[PDB]
Amino acid sequence: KETVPYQIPYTPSELEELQQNIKLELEGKEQELALELLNYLNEKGFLSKSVEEISDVLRCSVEELEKVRQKVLRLE
């Protein structure tokens, strides 16, 4: 790869795909958190920090954030 990529820093397709996949996959008390942070800050989601970060920001358990993230990341 010579020239710079296209998914940098962050692309819309990724964010939109993340939120959609969240509400399309997760549910109950899983998609809410994921979508919450996603809509709360687009910069924090696709390439968001470690699970610990998102968890600390959402004040929710890391385990949950990990499950939702893995479910929405499994697509990749």
CSV table of C-alpha atoms in Angstrom, one decimal:
chain,number,residue,atom,x,y,z
A,1,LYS,CA,0.0,0.0,0.0
A,2,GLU,CA,1.6,3.2,-1.2
A,3,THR,CA,-1.0,6.0,-1.0
A,4,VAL,CA,-3.1,6.5,2.1
A,5,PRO,CA,-6.1,4.3,2.8
A,6,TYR,CA,-9.8,5.3,2.5
A,7,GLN,CA,-11.0,4.1,5.9
A,8,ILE,CA,-8.8,6.7,7.7
A,9,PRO,CA,-9.4,8.2,9.9
A,10,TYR,CA,-13.0,7.0,10.0
A,11,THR,CA,-15.5,6.3,7.2
A,12,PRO,CA,-19.3,6.7,7.3
A,13,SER,CA,-20.0,3.2,5.8
A,14,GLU,CA,-18.2,1.7,8.8
A,15,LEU,CA,-20.2,3.7,11.4
A,16,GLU,CA,-23.5,3.2,9.6
A,17,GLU,CA,-22.7,-0.5,9.2
A,18,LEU,CA,-21.9,-0.8,12.9
A,19,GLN,CA,-25.1,0.9,14.2
A,20,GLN,CA,-27.2,-1.1,11.7
A,21,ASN,CA,-25.5,-4.4,12.6
A,22,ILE,CA,-26.0,-3.6,16.3
A,23,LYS,CA,-29.8,-3.0,16.1
A,24,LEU,CA,-30.0,-5.8,13.5
A,25,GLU,CA,-28.0,-8.3,15.7
A,26,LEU,CA,-27.9,-7.2,19.4
A,27,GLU,CA,-31.2,-6.6,21.3
A,28,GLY,CA,-32.8,-6.0,24.7
A,29,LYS,CA,-30.0,-4.6,26.8
A,30,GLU,CA,-27.2,-5.1,24.3
A,31,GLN,CA,-27.9,-3.0,21.2
A,32,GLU,CA,-29.0,-0.1,23.3
A,33,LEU,CA,-25.5,0.4,24.8
A,34,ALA,CA,-23.7,-0.2,21.6
A,35,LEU,CA,-25.9,2.1,19.6
A,36,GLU,CA,-25.9,4.6,22.5
A,37,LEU,CA,-22.1,5.1,22.4
A,38,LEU,CA,-22.2,5.0,18.6
A,39,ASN,CA,-24.7,7.8,18.3
A,40,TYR,CA,-23.2,9.6,21.3
A,41,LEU,CA,-19.9,9.8,19.5
A,42,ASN,CA,-19.2,8.6,16.0
A,43,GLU,CA,-15.5,8.9,16.7
A,44,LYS,CA,-16.0,6.3,19.4
A,45,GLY,CA,-17.2,3.0,17.8
A,46,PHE,CA,-15.8,1.4,14.7
A,47,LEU,CA,-12.1,2.1,15.7
A,48,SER,CA,-13.0,3.0,19.3
A,49,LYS,CA,-10.5,2.4,22.1
A,50,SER,CA,-10.3,-0.9,24.0
A,51,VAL,CA,-13.4,-2.5,25.5
A,52,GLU,CA,-12.2,-1.1,28.9
A,53,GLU,CA,-12.5,2.4,27.4
A,54,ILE,CA,-16.0,2.1,26.0
A,55,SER,CA,-17.1,0.3,29.2
A,56,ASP,CA,-15.7,3.1,31.4
A,57,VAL,CA,-17.4,5.7,29.2
A,58,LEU,CA,-20.7,3.9,29.2
A,59,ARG,CA,-20.4,3.1,32.9
A,60,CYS,CA,-21.3,-0.5,31.9
A,61,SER,CA,-19.6,-3.8,32.4
A,62,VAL,CA,-16.8,-4.6,29.9
A,63,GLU,CA,-18.0,-8.1,29.4
A,64,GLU,CA,-21.3,-6.8,27.9
A,65,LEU,CA,-19.4,-4.3,25.6
A,66,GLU,CA,-17.2,-7.2,24.5
A,67,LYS,CA,-20.1,-9.4,23.5
A,68,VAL,CA,-21.9,-6.6,21.6
A,69,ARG,CA,-18.6,-5.6,19.9
A,70,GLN,CA,-17.8,-9.1,18.9
A,71,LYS,CA,-21.3,-9.6,17.6
A,72,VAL,CA,-21.1,-6.5,15.5
A,73,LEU,CA,-17.4,-7.1,14.6
A,74,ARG,CA,-18.0,-10.8,13.6
A,75,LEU,CA,-19.2,-9.4,10.3
A,76,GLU,CA,-15.6,-8.3,9.4
